[PDB]
Amino acid sequence: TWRTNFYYNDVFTWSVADAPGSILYTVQHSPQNNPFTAVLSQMYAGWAGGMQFRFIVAGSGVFGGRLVAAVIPPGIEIGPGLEVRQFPHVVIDARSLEPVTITMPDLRPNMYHPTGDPGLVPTLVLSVYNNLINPFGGSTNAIQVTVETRPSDDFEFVMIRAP
Amino acid sequence: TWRTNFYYNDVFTWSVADAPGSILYTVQHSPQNNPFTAVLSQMYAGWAGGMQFRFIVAGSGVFGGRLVAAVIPPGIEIGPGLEVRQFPHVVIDARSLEPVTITMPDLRPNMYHPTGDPGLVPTLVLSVYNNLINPFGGSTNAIQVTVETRPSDDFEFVMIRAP
């Protein structure tokens, strides 16, 4: 189905100008981060469970540099000097050919979350850990990173919404 | 589920001024006529099957008059002198206490219909057959008719839509 495949959600740019600690991508955990859960969330009041995010770095396994994708607990705001490796995180190397996937989990497995006004949910943040390096000639000094998502196996919608 | 219950879709007015042959309500057969199929139709390319429409006339079983609800084949346009009883139809009496339900069926059970640009689909039309009569004093000369829908048992969505 749609819930077993990853689907394109977004894209962001990573350039040699983005210094360590810069945040290049951020998103609150929500059904709006997948195009199918975004549709279905309009007919349910509640949801629960994780969402997987898969990043493909278009650096032809050649560029140097690294991002850290980290899951930030609710009501912690993240700055640019902010350490994130204390949070559940995965490292994304510019030279990797393969996709790197991170699970944004449900941090409150105790209570269904609203599909409406979200309350207190985790945030996914992607920050520069090592500077992007274009070895040798540019003039390509920026690359793109695609973001695709799929609901985790524990993702669910509940409570039909009164229309 | 949502597909077993009728849900409010719309409302229309019937007044003593509406003469026989007036059209008081009309709608193309479509998933947009139920609030749940309207949501789900955004993630599918195709659909098929019938939709039930239930009308409750708010005439306290007292007003005189009748409407005919008729299903009009595609590409027949209906005027106000237009006979409809040759089409599948049900009669709605102003004096009825109970709801009156009509099935708008899939007239092309041979081919899934698009949820997008609809092509050629039947139309539900409600026309005055006998004038609404307020016996005795008004000053209520108009009543409302609520419209509720539910997918028929053969209703289906197919072909996940490329987002």
Numbering used by the authors:
A (entry chain A), B (entry chain A): 67 to 229
From the paper:
Mature RHDV virions are spherical, non-enveloped particles with a T = 3, icosahedral capsid whose outer diameter varies between 32 and 44 nm and whose structure is defined by characteristic, cup-shaped depressions.
The crystal structures of the S and P domains of VP60 were docked into the high-resolution cryoEM map to construct a pseudo-atomic model of the complete RHDV capsid.
